Structure 1
Amino acid sequence: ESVKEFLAKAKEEFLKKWESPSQNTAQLDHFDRIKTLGTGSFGRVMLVKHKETGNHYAMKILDKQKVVKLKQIEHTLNEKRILQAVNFPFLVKLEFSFKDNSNLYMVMEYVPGGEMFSHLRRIGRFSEPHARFYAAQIVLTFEYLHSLDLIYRDLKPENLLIDQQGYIQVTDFGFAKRVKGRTWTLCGTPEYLAPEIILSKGYNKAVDWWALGVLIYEMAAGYPPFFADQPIQIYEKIVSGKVRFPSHFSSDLKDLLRNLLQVDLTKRFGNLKNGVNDIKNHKWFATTDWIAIYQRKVEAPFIPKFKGPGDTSNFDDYEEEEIRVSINEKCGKEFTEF
């Protein structure tokens, strides 16, 4: 009942913000630009510093004209509307949003420890206790999101930031969506796509649980279970029903992964009548204190090395390009609700 009442209150608070989203809560010249942290086909993420408070933030900047061209309008409205409405210990916090003639802006707490991707590649692979610590946070985050009728759809090591206490902060809600029933958009990263996405079926929250299986495999092995030079070759392996496990995997880990990487979505863990409890009660999680994880009372496997809230040493170097704002408004109608 404690879990039921927790999720009931979580949905109440989410729906209130979902129905009346915040808008236009800062502007660009409130911030100093420090460094580019990441870049993509229609946007980038910048470390900025608020000029009055001195607080650091990660500012995601989306070029409206490129969003329209790459057909991401609904997705970018999804991302901001969901992000301003959620509240959970392992979700990055959105502090401000706003738009101008050229760009959409989402200003989030800056997580200085870097992406899980970098740490995993630097160490090679995580021990099973280490992987289990991160996986538990994802299980709880998906329990939270799915109860709000949200699907995340972009689980991968690059989107999991390690914070100052060594806990996960999920970033990038670019593909997240509120869904009652099924949805159909082809999106995600090829290595992490469930078979039903590849086969163009109407799919549901089960694709997140599949992605968790890929993520746990990758954390524990150092590479994802379906790998190839071309995406088409990755897709053939995903739909085949065949995964090979390293010998060092425990029997409990292999058993959990066979049930998360179940190609038949009606037999996949997290999508059965017991929902998430088939995962939480699995023998691989027998040592996990779910409440202690939620309360951030478990000592983390490692704390990232960084010097302070403005340290960027755990992120990589990108060409520094202008943040240009046109003298004319672009795509005003398409982003009216942002």
Structure 2
Amino acid sequence: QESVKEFLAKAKEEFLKKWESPSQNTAQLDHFDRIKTLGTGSFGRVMLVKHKETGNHYAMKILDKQKVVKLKQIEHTLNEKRILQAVNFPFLVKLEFSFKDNSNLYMVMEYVPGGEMFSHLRRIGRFSEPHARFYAAQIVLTFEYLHSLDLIYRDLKPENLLIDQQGYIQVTDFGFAKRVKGRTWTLCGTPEYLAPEIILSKGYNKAVDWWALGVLIYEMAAGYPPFFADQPIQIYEKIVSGKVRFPSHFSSDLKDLLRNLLQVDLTKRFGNLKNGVNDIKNHKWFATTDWIAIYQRKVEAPFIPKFKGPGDTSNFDDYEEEEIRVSINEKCGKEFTEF
């Protein structure tokens, strides 16, 4: 379709302009009041903050430079910020500011008060097929966009998909995203969502995102992912086996789509064939989907999260509140020069 081609051509032009001249150092920490920790991990956390001058709320991802270095995440962190400042798509979180100080890297993003899809999925148990399909269509369009820019996302899972005030998805967490022409090799991602070629240490490509979409759609519609176990090695054995069991409540169209996304041979996997994303968009399971209406955000969402206002944190959970320390001395300045 000419409209799609012209759209993706302009999308790549606009991405490349920002990719080649990234923004840096667009705020500082004391421009914000810290409100609450929204999530925490091994080298950083995300905090709800309020900008003092404007009153606007934001999600501030804070990465400890020393821990980033220790966990060998320098390149990944530089990828994340460079990609986020260059992308623009309705279902991608907007990066509003970035900056660094003696201790930390900061990415200040739009705050999405509806919470993680993970929470709603576990609360409701499973999504109906129409509900899962509404979210899946947004991911399909987002991956069509990212892949057209030579970006691989590499961290699709329910915790990384926030639900906004209109009930639409905002993809967060570009920590593993990478601009790749051709193949890449890093072992990264969450075990349940890894394609076989990642587990087998192969050079892999954007087809791993389409595999992860298969896992996500299965998990949304079943309530649990297709490959699970207590030990990652047992998960990996199931992933590489070519065996998936579907709940009997799955429609035949859903099972067919999932057999083609959860295709262990990457050369036969939907999204990675000659017709690319169109094998997915034209699949029977998406027959009711108005792709343009989804992109234009004209479809009524199946679900609007309950929240009281732009600063409401009720849909996020409670974490120990720790200091945001900024050392009197600069740490790892050389490593993060480009940030």
Distance apart, 1:179 and its partner CA: 0.1
Cα deviation digits, residues 125-173 of structure 1 (max 9, x gap): 0000000000000000000000000000000000000000000000000
Task: Please give the residue correspondences for 1:287-302 in structure 2 after superposition, counting only pairs within 5 Å.
Answer: 287-302=288-303
> How many angstroms apart in 1 are the aligned matches of 2:24 and 2:240?
42
Give runs of ≥4 in structure 1 deviating > 3 Å: none
The residue aligned with 1:182 is: 183
Which secondary structure does the structure 2 equivalent of 1:318 belong to?
coil
> How many angstroms apart in 2 are the aligned matches of 1:68 and 1:118?
31
Distance apart, 1:184 and its partner CA: 0.2
Distance apart, 1:8 and its partner CA: 0.2
Distance apart, 1:95 and its partner CA: 0.1
Distance apart, 1:119 and its partner CA: 0.2
The residue aligned with 1:18 is: 19
Task: Please give the residue correspondences for 1:222-301 in structure 2 after superposition, counting only pairs within 5 Å.
Answer: 222-301=223-302
Task: Please give the residue correspondences for 1:127-276 in structure 2 after superposition, counting only pairs within 5 Å.
Answer: 127-276=128-277
- Provide the TM-score with structure 2 as the length reference: 1.00
> How many angstroms apart in 1 are the aligned matches of 2:89 and 2:211?
22
Which secondary structure does the structure 1 equivalent of 2:106 belong to?
strand
Distance apart, 1:218 and its partner CA: 0.1
> How many angstroms apart in 2 are the aligned matches of 1:169 and 1:230?
30
Distance apart, 1:328 and its partner CA: 0.4
> How many angstroms apart in 2 are the aligned matches of 1:239 and 1:301?
34
Distance apart, 1:94 and its partner CA: 0.2
> How many angstroms apart in 2 are the aligned matches of 1:127 and 1:151?
28
Distance apart, 1:280 and its partner CA: 0.1
> How many angstroms apart in 2 are the aligned matches of 1:103 and 1:275?
40
Cα deviation digits, residues 85-133 of structure 1 (max 9, x gap): 0000000000000000000000000000000000000000000000000
Distance apart, 1:18 and its partner CA: 0.1
> How many angstroms apart in 2 are the aligned matches of 1:250 and 1:57?
40
Distance apart, 1:260 and its partner CA: 0.1
Cα deviation digits, residues 192-247 of structure 1 (max 9, x gap): 00000000000000000000000000000000000101100000000000000000
The residue aligned with 2:3 is: 2
> How many angstroms apart in 1 are the aligned matches of 2:40 and 2:246?
34
- What are structure 1's unaligned runs of at least 5 residues? none
> How many angstroms apart in 2 are the aligned matches of 1:228 and 1:219?
18
> How many angstroms apart in 1 are the aligned matches of 2:268 and 2:327?
52
Percent identity between the two aligned chains: 100
Distance apart, 1:249 and its partner CA: 0.2
Distance apart, 1:282 and its partner CA: 0.1
> How many angstroms apart in 2 are the aligned matches of 1:131 and 1:271?
22
Which secondary structure does the structure 2 equivalent of 1:272 belong to?
coil
